[PDB]
Structure formats: structure tokens, C-alpha cells
Design a binder for these strands. Structure first.
Ligand SMILES: [Mg+2]
Lengths: 199, 175, 124, 109, 138
RNA sequence: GGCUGGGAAGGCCCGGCGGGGAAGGUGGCUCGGCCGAGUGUUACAGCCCCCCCGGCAGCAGCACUCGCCGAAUCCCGGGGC
RNA sequence: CUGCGGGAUGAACCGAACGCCGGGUUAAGGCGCCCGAUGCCGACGCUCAUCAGACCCCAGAAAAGGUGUUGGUUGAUAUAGA
RNA sequence: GAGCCUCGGUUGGCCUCGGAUAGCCGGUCCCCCGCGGGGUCCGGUGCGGAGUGCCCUUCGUCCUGGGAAACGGGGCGCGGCCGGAGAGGCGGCCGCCCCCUCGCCCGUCACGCACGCCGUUCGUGGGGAACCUGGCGCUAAACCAUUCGUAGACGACCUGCU
């Protein structure tokens, strides 16, 4: 009953608008791997935009001024918050349902994560256009834990490779076992393929 | 003047008969307009621009849509333009490839609006003529004059991005 | 089975299968499926009318004072004639629906909505 | 023995940008995302079920804490499967983005 | 690495539009994203059709680029495009989708029972095979 | 119902006239097993296309939905609020 | 002396003018999220900006340049070989 | 076991990396590397059927009376071996007792059949507070007061005292 989305290959605003709309409808949304987010335009454009945002601060007291979060997950969180009525109680309650993470944390490392084709770079962006990765942008503006995240993601990918190898073995054995006892399930298979299955 | 899916209208008109001139001559024009009501207005505008004739002093003798003779054949159409820019006016010749003459004129209007920011009211259509494979000046039309023409669909960006919005599979662009 | 004089639908699921006796149902509260059994060769009793299924209790002129007057009796009687009519109808209905395979088990099942199932998408 | 109502979400009231009409609610039925599948749900009964501190009566059962506000589907709302609904009492606006069950038995098929 | 090309005589499948889900053959190319199409054996007349709404299969019949609707039909019949298309996995999957769409509640109950038995049998066999494989490994 | 007393299209086609893409053909060359595939040159039609002479029910703004205007030349039925 | 919908904001702008309500439909404006509605399998083209651009009043720019790119006009020469 | 308050809900999916002018699955006759990984070649699909346009589970009960399939499940079943550290907070692998004949097709009836009328059906033995059963373990520290100056407007801070 909770949406888990993989942030790799998704555009910032395109995914943020959809996530905010779903969150306002009472849906619980989890966004994972926020370093895979990419933004349209060359890297220098987005670097300059984030530096210009960094310049924004209260002259009399920067502590009370804007909070420039450097983590990619917090950057995505702020972009989503910009698309919500966060000043109202309803907006805050909706924003409480949102949850973002750098990398893929252990609570969600063993879950299937969905992707939104309406926010993917391969779909929404021309192949000849340039883009910038959110992880590299964050690392060059103050982020500290890019290498640790990369190492943990490599370990997680190795574990996922082991699990996927086991799944391949299980599926291959399942397919062979179906062939072994195909004579005892012929009547069950015929009715399945009569109504539009296994075809 | 606006634009839609234009149709070709043949409009015939003359000045009102007078005792001085018992039998005034008849004039006809080719007008591409969304409907006959605006076709009559365009005919009167062009006739007043050319002849000493106005709507009050004249009448419309016949107004009728001109059907495409060969809608099922692909043809090359040459259109001679007369439009106004921010600066002075200019004369243009453009070529389009379409099944119908009205479709060619609509493509001309769309292309003029896209490339030169020219509205419909600033554009005057002078002559539209069908041309064979030869006598074509624009390489864009000419590159399709090939019996053994081959081209694939390299990057098929999928539609239905909002048909079921959350999916576990990433889409495919190679087909 | 039939539509009565009042316009209500004479409904009867097999008692041995659905535990539904001879009852009336309304059209607006019933989903009509695309599954029909051959019921032409049955004889529904004529005395089974709309006036036959009606309430009888709640008479006025009792004392009414106290913890009494129609809060008791705790039940409604079976009215054994109903059982005779139900048995007579079922003895004819049951073999015809048993002729079609898996039809009795389908009747024993209960319709419900599950995840990913939408009534407008499915066809009934 | 199972669920006999379709899932819907109270998206909000009928409104413009700066004016809100609380006598008509907007519903988001799950699985319907076009102005062509909403014809099935037209006229369907809808209820907003909630619980409260005090006990209330219950038809065919002992008193419970559950109270409901009954409603009716009126018309579709703008090409996206959104449905306009009217209730006997306007929704408390606390149920924004909460579950509203639309029944299946104003049957006409 | 392309195996599908817009060639004169290429058979195309219409994804969406008025003639959705109907085969059609390319006659001539009108523009970059528009071509003259003709569907005589599939109840499709000769009119322009954009490349967006068509996905072309691996069937190509040979006829001149501007044939008058008569020789293309003859080539379609000689090549027997309908039978070849019906033999393909693509049409079988489309028909499976249609069968799923038209399945009634009684048919859904039958399918539920059939899967209920079949999956149990298959998973019992899978467990036995897993035990045998573990025995072989040790 | 009208129109260009609709424009094209579909089928059997018959007796002709010319023109053009450039093909079961030829051919410099190239790629594989005489054939298959790709380019050019004069180029008739056994791949075709277009105009002119003429005639058949097969039509109908056609559920092969290629683009009109419509209603004493217009009526019936159903659903929701 | 005048409320109402839109122009984020608002004297005079656009629409439209006021008894209390229910249903339907519009104007001017809009339909990624805030925010009601394109969650159309919208159509044709143009544009890369290390100062992009994004709607009367209106909240900002000129002369002069660019083989950056996209169309048009005119003029020559090229198998007697540019 | 009652006993107050507060709400959301109304089957789950336990998972590769990934590219888009490309990808998925096996055998790998062949080679290399630590049962597995990598490469060459070969064979099947690709508008994805090893499809989220998807998969998994049935959502009436009980009697006996047959066929197909079959040793599966349960007693918050009891004891060992592990994986999992990013924010693990979940599962996997083995030993011993007892109980049941569960899934699919048909016979066989019986289940307040409450006589048409709404919040039915669950995650939930939900979360917070106060009171009734037992088995296994507990014995205080903080502050004030006093004291000191590495501290200090007052608070605060650094220290000592069976
Ligand atoms: Mg409840």
C-alpha cells in the first residue's frame, strides 16, 4: 500500500509533480536512489543555478535564512515541497507521507521499486540534449557521503546479483518441472489458454 | 483571419448592372478559406484590391467548393506567396507534398507561421500549381522522389506515458 | 425464476447450495450475469405471489406498558408450507443446473472485489 | 464475505481558484482515468464511513461507533475519471485524501 | 542494427485510430511522418496514415509504389498475409488479450479453479526437483 | 434533400493515341550462394503510372467511417441529475 | 458612488454589473504541482542561451554585428571541367 | 477478563545491473577466472506471455463416498545451524512429539430459510492511559542544601564530602 520509486533516470520536476500529486491524495510514496535523478541542460547550467540559490541568504542573520540542503534526497524533498501547500495543515500532513533516501536503504533494498515513464529521461528528453546527474551536482556543492553511498550501493548490487541468480535458477527449474508433468495438467492448461492465458 | 482545415472555393462575382454598362463582365478567383462566409469576404477583399469593385456595388454570382480531382495520388504543389513582415513585404515561392491542394495550402500557412511568425491576415496567396517530380527547387521535397525509398524508425519514443503511470518495467525505444 | 406482480424478482438460490429460500429481490440491487440456465421446462407454483411474502406481526391494541409488547418472541416461525414449496421448486431446479459442469460450485461461491479488479473493466 | 464497494478518494470540493462550493464533492475512483469509464459509476451510491467517541444505532446489529454520510454520483469531472458526488450533508473536509466507498447497487446493467 | 524499414509494400499494424488493430500495407511515402496506405484485404481504404499510429511487421509484398489498389490486393492474396499473420505470435498475443477482455465471471471462476490445481501440482514438482538437486550437489 | 444533378474509389473489362517513373531486360562496378542484393545509362511495356477518345447494374457523402452543408428533405428508443 | 470571475499582487484593464437558493451552460481567462480542468497514444515547424523563453494595460531595452541555425530574393560558372 | 480515549484501513508481490542507432532467455560442444562469474559461437522470443496489459491466494461451513493428485499442513509446535550493521529488525537451513486428510471433479444432505432494504466482510490479540493471574531478575540516581574556584550580573559551569 506504499509506493516505492527508483530515482535513477527520472527528471527532477517531472517526478516531483507526480509524487506531490499522489502524496496529496493520501498515498504513501517512498523515493529511493535520489543520486540517480538528472536535470535537463548541461552540468554548468544547473551548477550555476544551485550556486545562485546558495547566494540567497538573510543579510542580517543567515541562521534564519534559507536552508540550503546539500544531499540529493533533501534537494528532491525541497523541490517536492515547492509543489505543495506546506503552509497549511493539509500540506504538512501530506508532506509527512513522503519519504526520500540517498541510495537504497536496507528497509527497501528487498522490495520491488516502480518507475514512472512520464518522468524518465529516455522518454521526455531528446537523445541529443545534455543532462546533469544530481549526485555529481550535490557532491560539488557540499555533499559529503558520495563515496560511502557508492560503496554501499556496490555491495547491495552484489547481494542483488546473488538473489537474481537464485531467482533465475528457481524459474528455470519451474519451467523444466512444468514440462515434466505436462501430461497431468493438459486439461488445466487447455482451459487456461482458452480464456487468454499462456498464449 | 484565422485558419483551420482550409477548403478551396471558387467564387464568381460582378459589379451590379447599371444603365451605362448593361452587361458587366464576370470575374472568378480561387479562395482557400475555412468556410464560404469568409471565402466571400476574401474574394471581395482581393477584387477591391485589384478592381474598382466593392461589396455594396457588386454581387456574388456563384460560390462553391472545389473538390480534389485525385485525392488518392501524391502530388507536388508550388505556392507563390506575398506576406508582410515586421519590415517591408516580400515575395516567396514554396513547395509542399500533399494529396490535396487545400492540404498543401494549409501546410503552407502552418510553415509560414512557424518559420517567419507570419499570421494569416498578412499572407496573400497568389498562385498554387501542381508540379511533377522535376521542376522542384526545394531538396526537402526532392529527397522523397525515390522509387526504392527506405528508412527505419530509429527512436520510437513511446506514448501513453500516463497509461498506467507506475510500472516496474522501463519502456522500450527500439522496434 | 420470475417477476411478480409488484415488479420484484422472484429469487431462489438452491437451499442446499446457497441457503436462499423463495425470496423477492429488486432489480436495482441485483447484478445480472451473462450465465443462463434452461428454466423453460419447470412449473412454478401459482400460489407463490407477492402477497404471499409479507409481514404479519406488530399489532397495536396490546397494553404496551412495561418491558413487554412485541420486544419478545425472539424469532419468526419457519411456516412449514414455505419448506414444502421450496423443496418442490428445488427438486426441479437442481438437476438442470447440475447438468452444466462446475455450475453448482459456482453457485456455492460468493462474489467479491479483490485487488486490481474493477467492475467497469470486467464483463458481466 | 468480501469487499463489495469500489475504492475512491475525496480529492476535494467543487471549486474555482478562489471560490469553493462545499455542496458538491470531487471523487477519485481507483482504476478510472478517462471520461469514458465513468458511465458505469453514474448514479452509484457512495458513503463516507467514520468512527466517533459516542455509540450510535446500527441497522441489523448492536450499537457501534461507526457513522456514515450517504451520497450519490452525479456526473463525471474533466477527462480524468474524476466524479462529482452530492451527499445529504457536506463532507467534513477532514476526509480530504481519505477513503470513500462507492457502492454497487443502484444497478442498471 | 535495424531490421524493420519503411519500404514500399511493408505490412503495418495500426496501434490506434479509426482502423485500430487492422493490418495495412504501405503504398507510397507522403512526407517525413506521413505515408499513403492501403488495406484492401483488411477493410481499409486508401488514405494517408501517419507513422505514429502504425507499427510495421516483418511482411513485405512487392508491388509498384503507386499501384491502383488492384495489384496490391492481388499481391496480398498471393502472399496470403492473413494466414501468415494468424500464425505469428503477435496475433496470438492480441487474441489472448481479447479473450481476457471477454472473459465472464463463470469463466473467471473456472480459471481460478484450474490455476488452483495446476499451481499446486507444479510447485510440488518444483519442490521435489529442488530436493533432488540438493541431493545431487551433496 | 442538395451539390459538379456530388469528387474520387471498388469489379469484368474491351478497340485505340501519346508521355513519364526506369524493369521478368541490358550493362561498368560492388557484396554472397546461374541465382539473391545495391548503384547508372538511351529506354518501348510483359513492374507500372498519367492525359485524350466510350460504356456497364454496383451505387449511397457508404460501419472498407477519404474530406460537405444540412431537416415539415426527421423520427424512434434508452441512461444519469 | 461598484460589489463579482480573470490579469499572482491591484482604482481606471478584459468579461460582466449585485435580493436568498437548487440544477445546467458560458464570457474573459485557463487545464504539470501549488490550483478546478488536456492523465488528448493532439497536428505541423522553429529554438540551446556559462544573461534562454514564457501572454493588452505591465513593470523593461536601442543602433550595430554573428558561415549558430532555418527559410526566401537576385546574380554569375560547371564536364569547352569550376 | 472487563475497562476509558484515539484513529488510518477492508489480500499480498520477499528485491539484478541496466541500454535506448538496442535488449531478454539457455546451452554453453570452446576458453579463462574464483557451484558461480566473464568471453566467443549457436538456438528461441522482442510492440515485451520468463508481459505490473503481470504473478501469487481464494472469499461459505460441515456429514460420507467415489475418481484424479498426494505426504503436505498445523499445534503464536518445542530445541540447534546461519544470513542480514546503511536506518538489520526480518527471514533462511536442520533435529523430536502429537494431530488433520486439507487442493481438483462429481453423488449426499444439514447449517435461525430471521419472510427485499444502510454503516456486511479485515490489517488488530491495533496504538495510548488505569485496574484483575503466575514464572524469571531488581536495588537507586538526579536536584536542592554545603563546599571549591580552572567559573560567574543572577541562573549556569569546573570540583570535594564513612
Ligand atoms: Mg469498521
Amino acid at each position: 500500500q506504499v509506493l516505492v520509486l527508483d530515482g535513477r533516470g527520472h527528471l527532477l520536476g517531472r517526478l516531483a509533480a507526480i509524487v506531490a500529486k499522489q502524496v496529496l491524495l493520501g498515498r504513501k510514496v517512498v523515493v529511493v536512489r535520489c543520486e540517480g535523478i538528472n536535470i535537463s541542460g548541461n552540468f554548468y547550467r544547473n551548477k550555476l543555478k544551485y550556486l545562485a540559490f546558495l547566494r540567497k541568504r538573510m543579510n542580517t542573520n543567515p541562521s534564519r535564512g534559507p536552508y540550503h540542503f546539500r544531499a540529493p534526497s533533501r534537494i528532491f524533498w525541497r523541490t517536492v515541497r515547492g509543489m505543495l501547500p506546506h503552509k497549511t495543515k493539509r500540506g504538512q500532513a501530506a508532506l509527512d507521507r513522503l519519504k526520500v533516501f540517498d541510495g537504497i536503504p536496507p528497509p527497501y533494498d528487498k522490495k520491488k521499486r516502480m518507475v514512472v515513464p512520464a518522468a524518465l529521461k529516455v522518454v521526455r528528453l531528446k537523445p541529443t540534449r545534455k543532462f546533469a546527474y544530481l549526485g555529481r551536482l550535490a557532491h560539488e556543492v557540499g555533499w559529503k557521503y558520495q563515496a560511502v553511498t557508492a560503496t554501499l550501493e556496490e555491495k547491495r548490487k552484489e547481494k542483488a546479483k546473488i538473489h537474481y541468480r537464485k531467482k533465475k535458477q528457481l524459474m528455470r527449474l519451474r519451467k523444466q518441472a512444468e514440462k515434466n508433468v505436462e501430461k497431468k495438467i493438459d486439461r488445466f492448461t487447455e482451459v487456461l489458454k482458452t480464456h487468454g492465458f499462456l498464449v | 483571419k484565422a485558419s483551420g482545415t482550409l477548403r478551396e472555393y471558387k467564387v464568381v462575382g460582378r459589379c451590379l448592372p447599371t444603365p451605362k454598362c448593361r452587361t458587366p463582365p464576370l470575374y472568378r478567383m480561387r479562395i482557400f478559406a475555412p468556410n464560404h462566409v469568409v471565402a466571400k469576404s476574401r474574394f471581395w477583399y482581393f477584387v477591391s484590391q485589384l478592381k474598382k469593385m466593392k461589396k455594396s456595388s457588386g454581387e456574388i454570382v456563384y460560390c462553391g467548393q472545389v473538390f480534389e480531382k485525385s485525392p488518392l495520388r501524391v502530388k507536388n504543389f508550388g505556392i507563390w506567396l506575398r506576406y508582410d513582415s515586421r519590415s517591408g513585404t516580400h515575395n516567396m515561392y514554396r513547395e509542399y507534398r500533399d494529396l490535396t491542394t487545400a492540404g498543401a495550402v494549409t501546410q503552407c500557412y502552418r510553415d509560414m507561421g512557424a518559420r517567419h511568425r507570419a499570421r494569416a491576415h498578412s499572407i496573400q496567396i497568389m498562385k498554387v500549381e501542381e508540379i511533377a517530380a522535376s521542376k522542384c527547387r526545394r531538396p526537402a521535397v526532392k529527397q522523397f522522389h525515390d522509387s526504392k525509398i527506405k528508412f527505419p524508425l530509429p527512436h520510437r519514443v513511446l506514448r501513453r506515458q500516463h497509461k498506467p503511470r507506475f510500472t516496474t518495467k522501463r519502456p522500450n525505444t527500439f522496434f | 425464476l420470475k417477476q411478480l406482480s409488484s415488479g420484484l424478482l422472484l429469487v431462489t438460490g438452491p437451499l442446499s447450495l446457497n441457503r436462499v429460500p423463495l425470496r423477492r429481490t429488486h432489480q436495482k440491487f441485483v447484478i445480472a450475469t451473462s450465465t443462463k440456465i434452461d428454466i423453460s421446462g419447470v412449473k412454478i407454483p401459482k400460489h407463490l405471489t407477492d402477497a404471499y411474502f409479507k409481514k404479519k406481526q406488530l399489532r397495536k391494541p396490546r397494553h404496551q406498558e412495561g418491558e413487554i409488547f412485541d420486544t419478545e418472541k425472539e424469532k419468526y416461525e419457519i411456516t412449514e408450507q414455505r419448506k414444502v414449496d421450496q423443496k418442490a421448486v428445488d427438486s426441479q431446479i437442481l438437476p438442470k443446473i447440475k447438468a452444466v459442469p462446475q455450475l453448482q460450485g459456482y453457485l456455492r461461491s460468493v462474489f467479491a472485489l479483490t485487488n486490481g479488479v474493477y467492475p467497469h473493466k470486467l464483463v458481466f | 464475505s468480501g469487499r463489495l464497494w469500489c475504492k475512491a478518494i475525496f480529492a476535494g470540493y467543487k471549486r474555482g481558484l478562489r471560490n469553493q462550493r462545499e455542496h458538491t464533492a470531487l471523487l477519485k475512483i481507483e482504476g478510472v482515468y478517462a471520461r469514458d469509464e465513468t458511465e458505469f459509476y453514474l448514479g452509484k451510491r457512495c458513503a463516507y464511513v467514520y468512527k466517533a467517541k459516542n455509540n450510535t444505532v446500527t441497522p441489523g446489529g448492536k450499537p457501534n461507533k461507526t457513522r456514515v454520510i450517504w451520497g450519490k454520483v452525479t456526473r463525471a469531472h474533466g477527462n480524468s475519471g474524476m466524479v462529482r458526488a452530492k451527499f445529504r450533508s457536506n463532507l467534513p473536509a477532514k476526509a480530504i485524501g481519505h477513503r470513500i466507498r462507492v457502492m454497487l447497487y443502484p444497478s442498471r446493467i | 542494427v535495424f531490421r524493420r524499414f519503411v519500404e514500399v509494400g511493408r505490412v503495418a499494424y495500426v496501434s490506434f485510430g479509426p482502423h485500430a488493430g487492422k493490418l495495412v500495407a504501405i503504398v507510397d511515402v507522403i512526407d517525413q511522418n506521413r505515408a499513403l496506405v492501403d488495406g484492401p484485404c483488411t477493410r481499409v481504404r486508401r488514405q494517408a496514415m501517419p507513422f505514429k499510429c502504425m507499427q510495421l511487421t516483418d511482411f513485405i509484398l512487392k508491388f509498384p509504389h503507386s499501384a491502383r489498389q488492384k495489384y496490391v490486393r492481388k499481391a496480398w492474396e498471393k502472399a496470403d498475409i492473413n494466414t501468415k499473420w494468424a500464425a505469428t505470435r503477435w496475433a496470438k498475443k492480441i487474441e489472448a488479450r481479447e479473450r481476457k477482455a471477454k472473459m465472464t465471471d463463470f469463466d473467471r471462476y473456472k480459471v481460478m479453479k484450474a490455476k488452483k490445481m495446476r499451481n499446486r501440482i507444479i510447485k510440488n514438482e518444483v519442490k521435489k526437483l529442488q530436493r533432488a538437486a540438493l541431493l545431487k550437489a551433496s
